[PDB]
Subunit: 396 residues, 4 copies
């Protein structure tokens, strides 16, 4: 009779949700409201004081959104959740809540581009300095820490080449120096990786990806201790970012997350097959996938992740032009940014996202002329493999 | 054949919208998507470069949200719009885009509470200092400006007692000293006040209030010059706040804004009647409404606003206890925070929102024991007056 | 404290709705669910028996939809409401619930086309015969009644030329002969006409038109005595048509109906102005509008309707080709079927809806070569008049 | 590049859908509109004539709904689809389109209750007679056919005890006598059974169940030859039932159906495990599940179905009272009607749905005092088994 005691699939379906109390409606009602009516002046005061429970206004909280926040707290084994307008807003609400002028952050370099831009260009303009390191080398993390360091920030697997970061080891290091460890768990979902269980303090997601799963919501979520989440809600979100989630967005995300287990199983079963295919193809120079035993951090990945994920990166023979030929030749895979949708998505950062950026920053950045990123969907993998095989044969 | 040439009611209905190009659908389609598919690698690069038009990903922009942004730009007579997750996020995305460590803001004191909290407690922690003044006295604004001042920030009418700020005069002052003027136009909507036409640089709204009008969306909008709005989108929103609007939220706001003209007319017709009623009631000590000729800035209000608004504040005889008795005695008016809904809403900040705050800060704050705020809805005003009359008679 | 006692505007806003009981949410929650969970086997039996209140399954009923049904019952001064998938489904659920093989219906001829097709071609194939008459001549109604007659069916105003039907007189006639009177009140809404108050037994609407008002819902509603509505729900809808409304559709319709009063006022103020304009134009041969004193049933219209409506029909000089030229020349008015949207809509049945139909059936049907139907929106009427003036000048 | 050529999982994801043509939006836009605007009078006529393609009005058709209709046509290997307001409306729109006064239907007895009520009580009142038979005995079907017989109507598996009907054999029989075969495929979905491939003429579903899968849509779909579907759309739906689907409902159903393959796999894997558990339990007298080899039509089920389904019926020792004790004792399984949701649902028709019905009709009806129906969800099956084990132990 407590959400937290059942099996993980049962939790994915039930945690945070129950039949509507007034009607018995099974689906979580969409509470698409701005405000909430009090029974009396007294009831109203009690709430605002934070001296009693219940709702006030949707920017502060909402019943639909609370369900999503509780569910994801359960799935990550955290105390509390807070939904946001976007994955970016989960990351910024978190870091702007934690940090102030004079503070320092140690961040992985191999992170999502927009996260990198916030940390590189915006944070320092608020007097918050960021040191970037290769987080696959925990010694670089240690060496960059300063007395001012409040936060160590990592993604794993990391967005270009799916390199990994040893969460338990990094956590120990951050904590030794009095810092918090923030892990962006977007690529894996709680079904595949649980950073809190390994020592992380706070997990953030873009729910836009696998947690929603259906390519129709932009949203984020933050999971952590109740004392942190309260500050993130009542200061970060309320005052600083304003990044509240729409109740309709939460409702969809709750709907999408119901099938998280079965989606992740299929995404990962499909991706392993595709990755093996790509590894045997004479036109493919490299394949980056945690499920291939040639992955340089293969055994860490086996300890830390329950499945190897739905994302594959790979380099095609012939560099830029061949990568451009390849992505213009797929008929099933869809050319787009984003990942974790039911559809297979493909992007060639060098001819697409990074064409005006110099060959030199790209390489610094882990991005070679022939690098393709593939988000594996729920189609028949034979169809995806055939589409790839055809596109690759043409391109090379 | 250009949105901007028609009458204001026609603009409210049509500006920013047209039949769907592929199907002829009259209602703006809800583009409830995360991502967008490119025809080719080439098409994709062109977009990311910002070297061609079209969509990429919903955090950056979306067709439904663009319609709302264009409509509101038209209505405010601004170049460009940007929708946000909330009114707060409109204000913060704006100010965090404009300001960096070492900068200064001159703000009105008589502003929305959560705005006040951001400026008082959060901004300074990013090295951005804020000086608060009585903005009804334009000399206080001038006296507080510093070489570091980037922004002057005002609301008009202002949220407790509906005091006004001379937008044209303040604009002239801010500009003389090289600062921008930001006006929060939430209380009035563009139907009743147009700050850009009076010299303001940027307008922000909580669309949660009268622009949406239906009490079912939390959202914000920012209107200004294209060069500012681009930075607000591609830095502020993309990187810093993450405060993007859901396409469903935009769709509803577009739907709600269709009736803006007719709603504002009725809200204001209703409020004037209620305000006159309250002014003749021997149990009511004061009535704050711009449409009453005893308003201390009555003639400014006549120059600057086309209608006197839908919000009334008033003090009931007997202070705190009588205000508490009064709001517990209404049967039609609903006790809640927020404003600009089709329903009449009432709040007694001293027994509700501000009961744990000391009698002394409250007065500083413009908030007396008997102060009630009333958001006039679209009901029959005789019904609202009778509900008030009954509640007041009981309370006193 | 009873919905039914307040003023009509107050009823439009509040009737059928209240704050959510479990949370205080002001907006009616969207109960977008299929089923409802019982506390026990006992609770479940009680409900199915129809021996206790509460929900079972959304085809039978739903909390969101119930709010809409109660509101519209209040507005029409009927006992009970039942929402449907469409206006057609309101009409068919009603008539298929009432009638069986061997029964007879007396219908107006001047009715909506799809209604006409159901009565002309489908009803008789179920052994239910229909006699069509000119319902503007109550003697034709009397003369067509038979011992088998269960129902007299009318629209007023009627869809081509806005001819009227004397509801009170027809009701008296139908009742004298033991039949029920069904009135389709779509064109007027309850704000402008109340057929139950004049003696009708059952009212039906396409809520797609003015009750929703926003051009984004297909739906219907039926209002009548509880004993009829129960049969319409538990037989007609449950078993025969299956025509249940989506809870999201109901939610939108509830949202749209909030502004019914202010929309109808503006639609009718706009239409009267446009109609006067069209009556003075030398290129316009006829104008059909109840608000023009030359309307042949002008004084009936003054007794029966509170406003003259938002729909205008008119004939342009030069017949078919000029009507085609005219509708291809409007730049603001939108060419489409449907009516009662915030946008101005125009249709030229002879070149559009009825081009393959012979000049001869069209005339029978009330439809002349130059007949244009105009649904007046909420734009500035000067803009609509200018668009019309321009299009008419060009066409003639 | 044709939907129909890919693997079944690929079809579930992609069939009927493509990126939005005007924007590239990946998610099918929600075209939540009533009407559609024409470019000219000419364009409008062309469409109405049925002499050109494109949209007119949402009751007739809509882009979102069309996607769903095309997808499901692909999945069932039929020519065309038509979405409806409910499963009931799919069945009635179909049969009322096909049949007229004097016609005859041969129906299975073991069908959904509301279907039974339509055929038993409503059809005959339109002069359409229905003969009910045990459809597990194809000779009873043959013996009941009459020269007037237009339709043979079956469900398989059938709603109480999951008895089967030999679709290929029944099809051959119906066709021999000049009748059409209609199969309600709701229990299986196209992932598990394809009646058209076995000779059925028309398939109907309640999409409320497994096709949507998420317990938040009431809807139906009809699949068949284009010439039948056109009549079902342009007469049945347009004129008779009015049972059109909301575009939002279609959008959700499209969203839900993306995971159909992976959901059905898990539902059926879970159900087989639960069914084996129930078969070994000394307190359970019978277990009705097609996947148990003791099922009396086990081998037919192996030929006709790809998986044995997600529904299990079973009788508990001690009849009525024990069944009532059992369902009041489950803590995880939810007491509700409906099936095919992500949640496990349970119903005890004798103490719930059929408590006021005499012990005698119930038995006629296949319904014993101890009969429980279980809709297996996506939870961990060990959790469901433990909940059952606990509830059963308590009840007996
Ligand atoms: C790891 C990770 N964290 C955070 C975000 C930010 O989330 P949002 O604000 O977009 O919801 C993304 C977005 N990843 C994207 C976004 O577009 N293409 C991608 O690979 C991401 O991949
Ligand atoms: C003038 C004004 N600006 C901005 C906001 C912030 O907008 P949001 O983020 O809530 O959309 C509010 C909210 N006013 C509220 C909020 O709750 N009660 C009120 O009077 C406001 O009144
Ligand atoms: C008077 C009236 N009754 C019933 C209906 C049927 O409603 P629905 O099923 O479409 O919601 C319409 C539709 N009138 C239309 C429909 O398209 N153009 C019109 O003038 C109508 O005008
Ligand atoms: C086989 C089958 N066909 C058609 C329907 C009708 O579909 P609807 O109109 O409800 O979408 C149901 C509903 N089955 C239900 C409905 O409530 N409990 C059940 O087992 C059904 O099980
Ligand atoms: Cl795949
Ligand atoms: Cl009022
Ligand atoms: Cl107009
Ligand atoms: Cl299970």
């Amino acid at each position: 009779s407590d959400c937290r005691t059942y099996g993980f699939n049962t939790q994915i379906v039930h945690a945070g949700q129950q039949p509507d109390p007034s009607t018995g409606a099974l689906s979580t009602p969409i509470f698409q409201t701005s405000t909430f009516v009090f029974d009396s002046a007294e009831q109203g005061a009690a709430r605002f004081a934070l001296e009693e429970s219940g709702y006030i206004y949707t920017r502060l909280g909402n019943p639909t959104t609370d369900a999503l926040e509780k569910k994801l707290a359960v799935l990550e084994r955290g105390e509390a959740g807070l939904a946001t307008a976007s994955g970016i807003s989960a990351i910024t609400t978190t870091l702007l809540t934690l940090c102030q002028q004079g503070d320092h952050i140690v961040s992985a370099s191999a992170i999502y581009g927009c996260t990198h831009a916030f940390l590189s260009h915006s944070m320092p303009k608020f007097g918050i300095n960021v040191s970037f390191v290769d987080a696959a080398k925990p010694e670089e993390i240690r060496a960059a820490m300063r007395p001012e360091t409040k936060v160590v920030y990592i993604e794993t697997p990391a967005n270009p080449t799916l390199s990994l970061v040893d969460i338990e080891t990094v956590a120990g290091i951050a904590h030794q120096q009095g810092a918090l460890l923030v892990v962006d768990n977007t690529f894996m979902s709680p079904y595949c990786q649980q950073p809190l269980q390994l020592g992380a303090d706070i997990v953030v997601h873009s729910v836009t990806k696998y947690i929603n799963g259906h390519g129709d919501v932009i949203g984020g979520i933050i999971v952590g201790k109740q004392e942190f989440i309260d500050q993130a809600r009542f200061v970060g979100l309320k005052d600083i970012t304003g990044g509240c989630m729409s109740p309709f967005n939460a409702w969809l995300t709750l709907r999408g997350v119901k099938t998280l287990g079965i989606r992740m199983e299929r995404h990962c079963e499909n991706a392993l097959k595709i990755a093996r295919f790509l590894e045997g193809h004479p036109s493919i120079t490299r394949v980056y996938y945690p499920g291939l035993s040639s992955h340089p951090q293969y055994e860490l990945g086996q300890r830390q992740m329950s499945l190897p994920g739905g994302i594959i990166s790979f380099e095609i023979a012939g560099g830029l032009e061949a990568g451009r030929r390849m992505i213009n030749s797929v008929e099933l895979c869809l050319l787009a940014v984003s990942l974790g949708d039911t559809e297979t998505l493909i992007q060639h950062p060098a001819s697409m996202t990074h064409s005006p950026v110099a060959p030199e920053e790209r390489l610094k950045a882990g991005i070679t002329d022939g690098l393709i990123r593939l988000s594996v969907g729920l189609e028949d993998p034979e169809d995806i493999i055939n589409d790839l095989e055809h596109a690759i044969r043409k391109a090379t």
